[PDB]
Amino acid sequence: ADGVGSSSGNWHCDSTWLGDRVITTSTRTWALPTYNNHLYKQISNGTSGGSTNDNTYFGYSTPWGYFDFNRFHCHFSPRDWQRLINNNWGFRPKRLNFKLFNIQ
């Protein structure tokens, strides 16, 4: 069972090269602050200031944060990238699996 005195999961970083599949995995440690003092806030930029008409926007900034893994260097070491680009014509993602654990 879960508790304050038992870890939620384990650290994992690997590249498993098997046949035509390569399974890359990465684990990181993150810190999530409190944004906007827990407020949604209208944010906007008008042409009234030094801004031009091209740079104007209207939107909202939330308290919520989000994870972005969308860059390759997250999932590949420079060596794992070298095996990839040297030996292979093409690659495409199949499936991903995502985990939060060990929350302080």
Please enumerate, by residue number, every residue annotated as part of a binding site for beta-D-galactose.
55
In the complex, the smallest distance separating the C-beta of residue 93 from ligand GAL, rounded to whole angstroms, is 35
Q: Which of 51, 77, 85, 91 binds a copy of itself (CB under 8 A)?
A: 77
**92: CB partners within 8 A, 6+ apart:** none
Q: Which of 23, 35, 40, 74 binds a copy of itself (CB under 8 A)?
A: 35
Closest to a copy of itself by CB, 55 vs 101, is: 101
Half-sphere exposure of 5 (CA within 13 A, CB side): 0
| 3 touching a copy of itself, by CB under 8 A | yes
The H or E element that residue 80 is part of is helix 78-87
Closest to a copy of itself by CB, 52 vs 104, is: 104
Question: Under the rule (CB under 6 A), what is the footprint of ligand GAL?
Answer: 52, 54-55
Region binding a copy of itself by CB under 8 A among candidate stretches 31-39, 45-53, 68-76, 92-100: 31-39
**33: CB partners within 8 A, 6+ apart:** 65
Cα–Cα distance, 12 to 84 (Å, whole number) = 20
Per the DSSP assignment, residues forming a β-bridge with 24 are 15
